[PDB]
Amino acid sequence: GEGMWVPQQLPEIAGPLKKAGLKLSPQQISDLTGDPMGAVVALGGCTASFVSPNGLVVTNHHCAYGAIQLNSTAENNLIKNGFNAPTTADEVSAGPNARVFVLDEITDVTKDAKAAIAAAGDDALARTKALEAFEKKLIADCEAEAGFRCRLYSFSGGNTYRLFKNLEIKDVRLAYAPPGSVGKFGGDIDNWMWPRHTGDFAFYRAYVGKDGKPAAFSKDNVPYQPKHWLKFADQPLGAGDFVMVAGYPGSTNRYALAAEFDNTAQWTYPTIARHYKNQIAMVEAAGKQNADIQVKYAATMAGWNNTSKNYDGQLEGFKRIDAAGQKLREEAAVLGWLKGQGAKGQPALDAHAKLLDLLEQSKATRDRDLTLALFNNTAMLGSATQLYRLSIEREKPNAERESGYQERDLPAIEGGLKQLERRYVAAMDRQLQEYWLNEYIKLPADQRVAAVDAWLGGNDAAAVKRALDRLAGTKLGSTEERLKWFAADRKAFEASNDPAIQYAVAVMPTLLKLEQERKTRAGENLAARPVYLQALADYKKSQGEFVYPDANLSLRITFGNVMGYAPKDGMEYTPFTTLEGVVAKETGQDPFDSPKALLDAVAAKRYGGLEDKRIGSVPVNYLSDLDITGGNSGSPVLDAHGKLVGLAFDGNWESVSSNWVFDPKMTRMIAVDGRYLRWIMQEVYPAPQLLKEMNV
Amino acid sequence: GEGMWVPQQLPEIAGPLKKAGLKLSPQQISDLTGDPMGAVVALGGCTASFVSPNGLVVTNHHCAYGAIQLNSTAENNLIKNGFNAPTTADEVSAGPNARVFVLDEITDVTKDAKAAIAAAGDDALARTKALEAFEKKLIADCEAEAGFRCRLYSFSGGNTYRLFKNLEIKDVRLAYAPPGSVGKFGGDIDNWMWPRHTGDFAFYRAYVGKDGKPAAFSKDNVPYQPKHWLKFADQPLGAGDFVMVAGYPGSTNRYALAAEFDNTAQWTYPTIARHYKNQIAMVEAAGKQNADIQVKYAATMAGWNNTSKNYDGQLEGFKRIDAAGQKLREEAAVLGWLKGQGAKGQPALDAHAKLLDLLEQSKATRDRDLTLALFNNTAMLGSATQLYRLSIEREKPNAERESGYQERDLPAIEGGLKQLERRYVAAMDRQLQEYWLNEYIKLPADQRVAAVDAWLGGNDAAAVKRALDRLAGTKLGSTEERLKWFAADRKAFEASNDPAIQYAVAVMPTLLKLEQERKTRAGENLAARPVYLQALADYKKSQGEFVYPDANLSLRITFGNVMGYAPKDGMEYTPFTTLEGVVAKETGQDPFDSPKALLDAVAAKRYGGLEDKRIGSVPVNYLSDLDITGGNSGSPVLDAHGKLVGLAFDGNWESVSSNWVFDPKMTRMIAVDGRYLRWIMQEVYPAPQLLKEMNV
Ligand SMILES: [Zn+2]
Ligand SMILES: [Zn+2]
Ligand SMILES: [Zn+2]
Ligand SMILES: [Zn+2]
Ligand SMILES: [Zn+2]
């Protein structure tokens, strides 16, 4: 059922967990560095878990997709073929930016954070800068112990702040990936859908120095020896059985003004979906002629497809549940209830008014803001602007450098510059530049940016072509040139005749002004947000509803049971899919082109010792009433005894609007069964070394 | 489960019946004029049943649709509005061809029929004429008692013959029909589909003379008083409950040569559907501008839509189960089996080669044969050929007149000419004549018909124009001219300058010779069919498989349980639909435009004492594993104690290929719950008088 519960809420879910079927004590779950919770790790936007004492990590194929793609070429395409390392020496690097974060400690810092903020006084921009400096100091102190990365989280609109400290493993290697047609069976057609038949798993191994301490990739590194790791279930998972997930959901918007919802549904989602579909269509068309573009843009294209389809689904779910109407009546109720409370309610009512105004302020420039951000997110302009900004930040003392441009960020920035080699083709990027220039030109006069208008020097197809022709002379196309500029100083950027550098120099003052504006709004939000969201929480509690913070990339627990759902009268979706349903979807063409060893093994009914009698087959995926979102991909699903029975990977079509308005009847997790991981690794793309190492 | 069982097979199915849940004794089901089987009646291509001691008969809406359509105009549309007669004096005639047949006696006459067949040559034609003669004399003797009609039936390819004797009620009146948006909710979109939400019901009353003998419509007639009628269940029907149907399935082809299947799959079904779709497109156009053409062509349209969709379904179901493969493979295996026992398996093997040749013979002219038959089925040419042929037969002694043209056929002949008034518009028929001439002209030259070539004046657009212009001259467009010719002698037809009559007089010698060719082809069939079919049966028995005769318009029993089915892995269709499901499909446009009163009753949860707790609503339609086919519409569904729980009306989409190859996993009846009939009559389109009459 509902709720992305923080660990600190365990006392409150202890009873519900037992009722649902958990056989572990709640204290055993409350030990976040113990067994089994200490086996759960963060990857930075996906979750994973250890599954051997020698550092083996399991997650979704779509989480490892970036790493598989970085190790792929047109001629040797691991996305297509899978990957398998017979020995740990055969493992390939997942890329310099790949990470496994192992939870060490969580600290409440709410009192100190709120004091740092209060000490700024009336000024919105100061209040932002106070919170920044507080965070920077806190994180510098916490990261004084080498090998650790820390993160500060704000919960419930700034009513609670906690600090997380994590061991930061920085040498992550790819150990195994099934073929693409298993890992992404059904592709974008089955994305966000049930029935689902997708073997969405992959394995990493985590490495540290011979001295035990995190290091970047080196052949002298050796496997990390985790304190705790998961075991595979020895009891067959069935319909109605208890399941629980712990992971790192990224963002929800369940506490939101009706106006924030209205702008999202009416403008944000449709606009983004359209832009992403336009880019898909260009890249798709060009990748058909050019297998180098197809392999280099594949991870980008996966993200665009997934987000744009998610947004289409949210819009449809909003209509199905009348989310607009719900948000309007709920807000009417909360404001009523507040007015109800005399003077005691006034601070929340005023905070509501301030939040509404700040939404209006961001709305006035939304087209400009989005269009400029995505234009500058093309590969050369993004490299130019990032690196120019770094050169500026490098002239301030580290403590005053903008988050993302501090010494602690330099490894990521450098890694990003190298990884781009596997993700960029000039003739492809050119067409994306051109799309965004043509979108820019459609902006009305008050959403335009002088610096870009002057650089374009024209408002028509010829000016667009001249600009593209100019940018095409950049040298930032090569990794070596990007790294040169990574180390160069500000005056060197300002002297350059590289046309992408020249663009970054021309626009940077405007970028910095826009950033100050966003910080100013954020500072006003810091004043109003906690007070209104505390009112929302108090109101929900007075109605007997579940109260838990919106997702914010920190560790949450959700629990419930294996069950289907009923999309329309006269039909039900069953909790499981089976091997035969995979074969039934076979067409021999992408995305429905399973490995021939799969087709043969199912035809021959080789169930590998993994058959569940109750469904007559090996299970493939299943549905459950857990409450997950983006960031939970790769989260282990645990049974009543804390054993691994699957990995979370998706939500069904109707679930996705639950980001804004939770619907219990149609909100389900889609998970890949542990038995299907094992079956694939037995019968289809064998990895007998890994099954051995997992004691199966 | 599988089986359209003859009542004589009751001993075989007694134990199966008990195991499935029948609580009546098998010998009570055996009493075909007892309780409840004696309440089941035949309408002629639909079933129905008695539901009060005053002659009330319930059947489907689409079985009553002819009658409703006959009593409808543009300016009073009963199809749209429904019909309710508050007293029996208000009931309108169903039309002169409408019948209720009440079963009186079955007789085996197999020995006699086979002797009479044998007694003929060894000439094929004489064999047909000898069976014809034998049937005619049986029927003449059986019909000698005023008020009865009799039928001879051949079962299992001519291994058994039984004679049925029926009371023939000839005055049938409409008592109630719900509005078309209930009776045909979902129209042709939901036709042949589940989930289904269609209230497919209507009521007649049966009338006899004041002496209690059958008579044609008159205001002196009085309600028939049936010896047995059905009672509504008092136990709620739920999932897994026992159900059974008795009724009159028309045709199955489950005993068939593989090439029979192939020709049907590859030629017959595709061709007929194509033709039917083309006529639909034409009539649909002309009726959207023309309310009179729309109403008058409504029943014809419904028929074309329904068969063409059925055939589209049968083709898809063939591909889904590889019907062609399964047929080929089964035929191999029974050919195998037969040579198999050499000496004694020799008559059967011979038979197969005959049947196969006969089929190649049909095949030679099949395009000619279809095109000619359908061309002559247009309204004016059909009337003129039928009427001229009647003039020719009337010159022979009645015992030698062709079946369909004897004294006993005159009522239905005369009736059809009158009913044609409600189904004919000259502008529309012209377009249909055009359509079929166009199709005739493109016959390949060896499949032309000499007389029609001549009648036409060679074959191009010009001749077609002239054809049509000429036939427009007919006076057969009026009921009265048609009846004038119903009485006229043969030389009066040959004298006529009516252009439609002149077509018939021109073409008849050909039609008679073609008929002779068919009777000859059939006679040869009469030899080989019973022997080869009896071997198909013998082989099924030896494989433990179920053995029952293909359907033949005679009374059959099917039994099983209420259950869903699973079209694809990860989903199931539930056994019931509910009121809420009807409202979810609402669009306010045809065909999803329920009565305001239904929409309001469902919004209000006014379930009228009819809610079934297990599904949380009033049931609408339900699925079960009974084995029904065309002719079974209107058949009453009975529960374990012989109470009415439903009417059969359709099959799910994947069921329909079971006409050729029975698939138990996807073959379900779709029925309308007796609770929904009651609910509609309480809350939506009320008929308190009929509810009181049925003791509910
Ligand atoms: Zn452990
Ligand atoms: Zn470096
Ligand atoms: Zn088994
Ligand atoms: Zn008459
Ligand atoms: Zn109730």
UniProtKB/Swiss-Prot annotation, chains A, B:
Q: What SUPFAM superfamilies does the record point to?
A: Trypsin-like serine proteases
Stated family: Belongs to the peptidase S46 family.
Q: What PANTHER family does this protein map onto?
A: PERIPLASMIC PEPTIDASE SUBFAMILY S1B
Q: How does activity depend on pH?
A: Optimum pH is 8 for the hydrolysis of Gly-Phe-pNA.
Q: What is this protein called?
A: Dipeptidyl aminopeptidase BII
Question: What, per the annotation, is the impact of changing D190A?
Answer: Decreased enzymatic activity to 1.5 percent relative to wild-type
Activity regulation, per record: Completely inhibited by the serine protease inhibitor diisopropyl fluorophosphate (DFP) and potently inhibited by 0.5 mM ZnCl(2), 10 mM o-phenanthlorine, phenylmethanesulfonyl fluoride (PMSF) and N-tosyl-L-phenyl-alanyl chloromethyl ketone (TPCK), but not by N-tosyl-L-lysyl chloromethyl ketone (TLCK). Activity is not affected significantly by protease inhibitors, such as chymostatin, leupeptin, N-ethylmaleimide (NEM), iodoacetate (IAA), L-trans-epoxysuccinyl-leucylamido(4-guanido)butane (E64) and pepstatin A or by CoCl(2), CaCl(2) and EDTA.
Note the effect listed for D498N. Decreased enzymatic activity to 16 percent relative to wild-type
Swapping D650A leads to an effect described as: Loss of enzymatic activity
> What is the uppermost EC class here?
hydrolase
Instruction: Provide this UniProt record's keywords sorted from A to Z.
Output: Aminopeptidase, Disulfide bond, Hydrolase, Protease, Signal
Is Protease found in the keyword set?
yes
**Statement: the UniProt record of this protein carries the keyword NAD:** no
Lineage of origin: Bacteria, Pseudomonadati, Pseudomonadota, Gammaproteobacteria, Lysobacterales
Organism from which the protein derives = Pseudoxanthomonas mexicana
Query: Where are the active-site residues found?
Result: H62 (charge relay system), D200 (charge relay system), S633 (charge relay system)
**Effect the entry attributes to changing D550N:** Decreased enzymatic activity to 21 percent relative to wild-type
What changing D200N does, per the record, is: Decreased enzymatic activity to 0.15 percent relative to wild-type
Stated consequence of mutating W192A: Loss of enzymatic activity
- Which is an annotated GO molecular function term of this record? serine-type aminopeptidase activity
What positions does the entry give for substrate binding?
N191, W192, N306, G631, N632, S633, F649, D650
> What does its UniProt record remark on the domains?
The chymotrypsin fold (25-276 and 574-722) is the catalytic domain and the alpha-helical domain (277-573) is the regulatory domain necessary for exopeptidase activity.
